[PDB]
A and B are shown apart, each in its own frame.
Chain A
Amino acid sequence: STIEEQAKTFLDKFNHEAEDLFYQSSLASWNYNTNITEENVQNMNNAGDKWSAFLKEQSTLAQMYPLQEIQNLTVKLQLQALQQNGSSVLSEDKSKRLNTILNTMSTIYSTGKVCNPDNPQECLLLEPGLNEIMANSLDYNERLWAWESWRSEVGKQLRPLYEEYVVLKNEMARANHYEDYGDYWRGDYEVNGVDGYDYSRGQLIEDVEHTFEEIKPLYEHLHAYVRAKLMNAYPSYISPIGCLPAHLLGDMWGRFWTNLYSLTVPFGQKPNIDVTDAMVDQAWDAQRIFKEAEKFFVSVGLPNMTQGFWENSMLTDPGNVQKAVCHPTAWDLGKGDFRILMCTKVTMDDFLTAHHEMGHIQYDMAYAAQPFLLRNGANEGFHEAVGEIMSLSAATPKHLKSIGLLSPDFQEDNETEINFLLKQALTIVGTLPFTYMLEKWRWMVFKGEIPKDQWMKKWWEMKREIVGVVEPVPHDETYCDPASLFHVSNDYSFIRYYTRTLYQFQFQEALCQAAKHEGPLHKCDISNSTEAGQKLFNMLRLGKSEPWTLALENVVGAKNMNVRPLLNYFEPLFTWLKDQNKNSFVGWSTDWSPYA
């Protein structure tokens, strides 16, 4: 007789049918991804279209139960995700045009090649090709050539498509009662209907700026040290006062600076933390890696993995004709079916990536008791930070001596910690200005503050303002330089990587406060302390059933995103950089001094 019981019966019916169809869709996606076959592609398309049609029909049926008369907050959380119309609010021809634009942008991004002008004889794709020449090569001219060629090709091929994608997504979000598509992207962090714990979606652009104004001295010192060190390899191309060129940052886009560590190592004469020689001399295997990682998880107090995880995962390259997508992906197919698809070899990087993917699997296991709408992360940063907890903890020398892998008399002096914290800085605090810059640029573009004839001018100035990187040659609006990245060309929100990089240090600080670690935060280990695992599992089991402010406050005691754990993590590195930059020009002004 009431709206509550009708909504609860509708949600039970949707949960059972959606779990069934989502298991079918995820099994089809798994069968496609571990074994590329055109029949598997057709099965995956059929299952995805069945799930899309089912979700559209239940989104149509969910509008009849109004949210204004519902008092239960979990029913509100389950029904807001259903009553969102999405792209179906448009006309059929506009939705078809938007989907066609998305698929053609994906195919043109995937099918790029690095063939030289006037030398078309042979080339590769980006992953065997451009990754090697931009990450590992020490030459200036070939890096500049590959960079300019790829940005030029993707710019002419995607500048109309990305412009029309912006226009259609803006019309979609204005039709769906949001201000812009960036405002739609900030709806994942929105909390409403809870007094005190509520979080406006316009408060995210305040908190991100507030945390970046305290990131920015550490990034200025890191940029000054990198600029001072990189003149040894590039003497005439880099000015001592101006900004860095774009193609020398150890990546295609400068997203991760982690390949610049070999060029900027502080103390090369010290022995390294690289355990790969002892890992291959002890004859490790992928099963041994996952067993030691599962021992690491059960030492913290999280439950061990099911027999279906061991019997169904793909932990090795299957063979000759069974090609697989070698990217590390943790799969939650639902109904207790957790598995990892990751091609492995004996490597410390694959060890840490296995810890990352089993962190994702454990987080999928923890909210498995929740209903189907609430089986996701509290926001889009939680689900990627929970694996990075394991990635930070598994890299420590205490953990690598716990499993007997690192040598027991390896001494943790000052230099062997500074040159590890610098690698962690290039991995973590190097991606914060690029992420905040790119998402600020996308929010201003989708908001309409930047016209189409000022996209690139505003972007490179913003790059000069935030990241401290100048263009190698001057570019104009004939190119679309940011859209060459994987996430922006495939309709992925990208600010998830900013809050992840802050939440991982908040959670680890809380879980190092719980584990009673006396020493520094970078030497802290989560292992052997069940009281840290209970603190973590009290938040991992909630899912979307609770606001992310309350789930954050359950761990760290603060109901907002905070930046102080990241600063006091890098405090010995920050003091060493402040004592190192006695006479170098710390920071920068925006300039064209290294190149006009």
Chain B
Amino acid sequence: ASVYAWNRKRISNCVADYSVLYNSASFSTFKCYGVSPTKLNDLCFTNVYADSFVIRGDEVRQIAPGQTGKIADYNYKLPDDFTGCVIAWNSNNLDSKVGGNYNYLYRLFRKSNLKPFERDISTEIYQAGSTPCNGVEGFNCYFPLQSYGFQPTYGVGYQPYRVVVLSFELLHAPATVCGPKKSTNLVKNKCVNFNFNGLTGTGVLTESNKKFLPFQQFGRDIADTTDAVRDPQTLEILDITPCSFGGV
């Protein structure tokens, strides 16, 4: 999308791999302002909002908290308390046209600054004087949207950069977007420290003859100790025998 009409995509109920995005070397700019990639792998968030637009290379620095400029005032305002990531890469091989790609617009004139994450696709004629516009173009009445040129022979700083901004947030709601869980291999018949779906402990994990019902995951004895469990990777039942400590 163009930056005056930036696309916003709501992301929820899924597992997100930010490590492929960070490890991709094609991104010319990867700035995160309240998180880390390991933190992104270890923080669960309720909502992820993907804002996508095309700007120039010079306009990439304006996508930040506390910045000022034609994009940051009149097109896309980021709040000062932003917790998210800004990802930018050069798109000269796709967006640029040899005759000029005039299809990517941006808002040059507006009466007031934007509130954070506001969008305004209105084509209202900017009245810069006391003389009324009455819709028509005049000597002080300008059309607010202007076209980027985006030719492939432009220098860096005028070349088209696709920018995706991810906004993460925690609300008074159950959080569901959370990073890739790295499960290791399963080792049986040894006293190991097990961590099964957030249930941790120490024990010997052996094969079990207890046939669980499909909705049940863990097993408890009379004394409310976890002695049976289901492996989440392969649906098999394992007994947890305590490690064989004794008196000497």
Contacts and interface: CB of A to CB of B under 8 A. Distances in A.
Interface of A: 1, 5-6, 9-10, 12-13, 16, 20, 23-24, 27, 61, 64, 306-308, 312, 333, 335-338
A61 B128 CA distance: 15
B108 A16 contact: yes
B246 interface: no
Contacts of A307: 156
A236 B73 CA distance: 80
Contacts of B36: none
11 contacts: A6-B128, A6-B129, A9-B109, A12-B109, A27-B153, A61-B139, A306-B156, A308-B153, A333-B153, A335-B154, A336-B157
Contacts of A20: 147, 149
Interface in B107-146: 108-109, 126, 128-130, 139-140, 142, 146
Contacts of A336: 154-158
A86 to B, nearest CB: 20
Nearest to B146: A16
B128 A9 contact: yes
A335 B159 CA distance: 9
Given A13-B108, A23-B149, A338 B155 contact: yes
A335 B155 contact: yes
Task: Specify the main secondary structure of chain B where it touches its partner.
Answer: loop
Given A5-B128, A9-B128, A12-B108, A312 B153 contact: yes
A335 B130 contact: no
A337 B128 contact: no
A337 B109 contact: no
A361 to B, nearest CB: 12
Contact of A6 (B140, B147, B156): B140
A6 B157 CA distance: 28
Nearest to A63: B139
A64 B139 CA distance: 8
Contact of B149 (A61, A312, A335): A335
- Chain A contact surface mostly: helix
B100 to A, nearest CB: 8
Nearest to B57: A336
Nearest to B109: A9
A333 B153 CA distance: 10
Nearest to B142: A13
A9 B156 contact: no
A236 B153 CA distance: 61
B139 A337 contact: no
Interface string B158-192: 10000000000000000000000000000000000
Contacts of B140: 6, 9-10
Contacts of B139: 61, 64
B126 A337 contact: no
A308 B154 contact: yes
B103 to A, nearest CB: 14
A333 B146 CA distance: 20
A64 B138 CA distance: 12
A32 B158 CA distance: 24
> For A13, A64, A333, A336, which residue has the most chain B Cβ atoms within 10 angstroms?
A336
A9 B142 CA distance: 9
Q: Kindly list the 8 A-B residue pairs having the minimum CB-CB distance in the complex, ordered from nearest.
A: A336-B155, A335-B158, A9-B128, A336-B158, A6-B128, A335-B154, A306-B155, A308-B155
Contacts of A61: 139
A9 B126 contact: yes
Given A23-B149, A333-B153, 4 more contacts: A10-B140, A308-B154, A308-B155, A335-B158
A24 B146 CA distance: 16
A9 B109 CA distance: 8
Contacts of B142: 9, 13
A1 B158 contact: no
Contacts of B126: 9
A303 to B, nearest CB: 12
Nearest to A20: B149
Contacts of B158: 335-336
A337 B149 CA distance: 13
Nearest to B149: A20
